[PDB]
């Protein structure tokens, strides 16, 4: 109904995925998805609201209830969102992946009558097609995307990227039975498209995020303050999070370039508070700015005015898991090189990475630490190391030598939180890294640890200087 604000943002190495899990496809290119911005805005808003509610009332509310409270700005099944997002990526005209030709009919030869796995690899600057049947044919091809020779190295060096590249790299072709040449050609052609689209990674995607506001949706009960809180949540999203895939590991990190209010009475305390990030001389200044914004919303800003509404719902402790910001855990270091930083994040977050190996020993707590702060991992009861030891370093009863005890994680008595921590595959990582830049050529590595609700009053002191050590070793 009317333009509210306009934010020129900048994402570094976004890993946006579309229907094919890539930023480009045969039909269009899309580096920034407005639906992802909306979803991450709502996710950060819920994190920020539980942060607030816990820094005043010590209470934590379900995501359902939080979004039911904010459904006047973000909309729900019962009400249309009052805010309309409009991404404008400059240069965002028609671009798509076109495979002008690929010179197979030699790979098809060495494939027939067999059952082989056709692996690919794009380093050496020429696409080779490894075959586990012991042959490596170099493939000639012409595409529309020009992999800049920096992207090949960024993918070959980053152990996380080259890991998530296993899924876009191979097919197990079975030509034992009736197998013409044409359909094998299309199979390998789509495999090559799926592999090449993965390398559409650009550095410094720059877009303009407009926000429109429906005024017709009146100040029903607490619209203005809900909206201000949502705009603060959007700023916190732009400051602490990124867009796209693996934002917990620095990719897609956002950075402000320009903010412009158009309705002072609502946002003129976000306009300047984001101007507070167009120039960041040192790391300490940035950490101070972040603590400033974080504290502002904590006590000084709006109030408990709408938390007094009886629509929220306190979380069950043993059946729910919510996240919230902890102001203490906000290490900042100057970057001097972004690609190497992203590659060292793996040293930070891998159980055999030579930074957490040099910050944590006994390996058990190490596993434990990552299992509690590195999202889901695939541990299985086969060779003892899981037996008891890591179960011990997570008991909420039973000792205090580990500074982190999961709420209902029980010794052989796993009911819900045990399976959630050890089996639930889709678990975000609490330890997160981000990279920021300003209008100057200053770049900083934030490393933070979101506070979760399955920690039984974690020792905020041990993990705090674990985080400075990690942030040092990876920069």
């Amino acid at each position: 109904e009317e333009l509210l604000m306009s934010l020129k943002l900048k994402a570094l190495y976004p890993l946006t995925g579309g229907y094919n899990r890539h930023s480009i496809n045969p039909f269009y290119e899309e580096l920034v998805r407005p639906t992802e911005i909306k979803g991450l805005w709502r996710w950060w808003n819920r994190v920020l609201f539980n942060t607030l509610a816990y820094s005043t009332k010590g209470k934590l509310y379900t995501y359902e209830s939080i979004d039911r409270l904010f459904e006047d700005v973000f909309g729900s099944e019962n009400k249309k969102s009052a805010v309309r997002l409009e991404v404008i990526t400059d240069e965002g005209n028609d671009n798509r992946f076109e495979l002008s030709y690929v010179e197979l009919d030699k790979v098809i030869d060495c494939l027939r009558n067999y059952k082989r796995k056709v692996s690919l690899d794009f380093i050496d600057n020429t696409l080779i097609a490894e075959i586990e049947g012991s042959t490596k044919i170099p493939i000639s091809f012409k595409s529309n995307l020009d992999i800049d020779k920096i992207i090949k190295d960024l993918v070959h060096n980053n152990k996380l990227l080259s890991f998530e590249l296993l899924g876009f790299k191979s097919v197990e072709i079975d030509a034992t039975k009736i197998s013409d040449k044409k359909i094998l050609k299309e199979i390998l052609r789509d495999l090559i498209t799926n592999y090449l689209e993965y390398f559409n990674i650009k550095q410094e995607v720059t877009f303009t995020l407009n926000i429109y506001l429906d005024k017709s949706r009146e100040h029903k009960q607490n619209f203005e303050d809900k909206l201000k809180f949502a705009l603060y949540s959007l700023l916190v999203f732009i400051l602490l999070g990124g867009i796209g895939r693996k934002t917990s590991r620095g990719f897609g990190s956002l950075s402000i370039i320009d903010v412009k209010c158009y309705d002072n009475s609502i946002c003129k305390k976000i306009e300047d508070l984001a101007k507070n990030f167009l120039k960041i001389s040192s790391g300490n200044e940035l950490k101070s700015k972040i603590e400033s914004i974080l504290d502002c919303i904590k006590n000084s800003c709006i109030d408990t005015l709408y938390i007094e509404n009886n629509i929220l719902s306190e979380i069950d402790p043993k059946k729910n898991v919510v996240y919230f910001i902890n102001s203490d855990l906000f290490e900042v270091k100057r970057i001097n090189d972004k690609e190497k930083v992203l590659a060292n994040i793996y040293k930070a977050v891998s159980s055999e990475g030579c930074c957490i190996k040099s910050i944590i020993t006994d390996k058990y707590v190490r596993k434990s630490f990552l299992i509690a702060f590195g999202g889901y991992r695939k541990v299985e009861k086969d060779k003892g190391l899981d037996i008891g030891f890591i179960k011990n370093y997570l008991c909420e009863t039973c000792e205090t030598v580990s500074s982190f005890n999961i709420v209902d994680f029980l010794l052989s008595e796993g009911s819900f939180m045990s399976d959630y921590i050890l089996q639930y595959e889709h678990r975000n990582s609490l330890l997160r890294f981000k990279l920021i830049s300003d209008n100057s050529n200053n770049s900083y590595l934030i490393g933070y640890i979101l506070h979760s609700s399955y920690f039984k009053k974690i020792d905020i002191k041990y993990v705090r200087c674990i985080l400075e050590k990690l942030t040092y070793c990876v920069i």
Partner: protein
């Protein structure tokens, strides 16, 4: 020429007189205005020397010590054991920064010899036991902040933050 002096907040009696000047100019770095302490400073790697209160250099980044940057220089019986320092106000790890700085500060640190005959096993210590808290309400927050009980009738609020903010690591030998 504007200088300052870093004074730490331990749980012992080594603060009441350490410096000459308290006002010097017209505005302290740390302020207490209607919300509590601000512009607190933290130095990372030093531990307290409560017996003959000073700071000792440790190479541990996990080690840190709180303090306030008060205007002044120590008592003119000094300048042989104090890490005075020139900084462009962005090497300073402030806390709750309110206003912009002059981008150059000289700081007198209470510095101690590395006392190279004992391993520096430092224990973490917080500040509690309101006996000494009410001691420091006026022994350290009145001679410098005579704003106490004149405009800040809320000097419980200047406690409302020391309950949580200040903490350190001490040798305790």
């Amino acid at each position: 020429s504007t200088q300052r002096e870093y004074v730490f907040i331990p749980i012992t009696n080594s603060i009441t007189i350490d410096v000459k000047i308290t006002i010097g100019g017209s505005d302290h770095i740390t302020n207490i205005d209607e919300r509590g302490i601000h512009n607190v400073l933290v130095i990372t790697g030093y531990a307290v020397d409560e017996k003959n209160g000073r700071l000792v250099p440790t190479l541990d980044p996990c080690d840190y010590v709180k303090g306030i940057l008060v205007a002044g220089t120590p008592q003119q019986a000094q300048s042989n054991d104090f890490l005075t320092l020139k900084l462009p106000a962005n090497k300073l790890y402030l806390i709750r920064k309110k206003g912009n700085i002059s981008d150059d500060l000289k700081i007198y640190i209470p510095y101690s010899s590395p006392d190279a005959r004992n391993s520096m096993k430092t224990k973490p210590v917080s500040i509690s036991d309101d006996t000494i808290v009410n001691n420091i309400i006026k022994e350290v927050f009145d001679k410098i902040y005579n704003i106490t009980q004149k405009e800040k009738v809320k000097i419980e609020k200047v406690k409302e933050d020391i309950k949580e903010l200040f903490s350190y690591y001490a040798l305790e030998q």
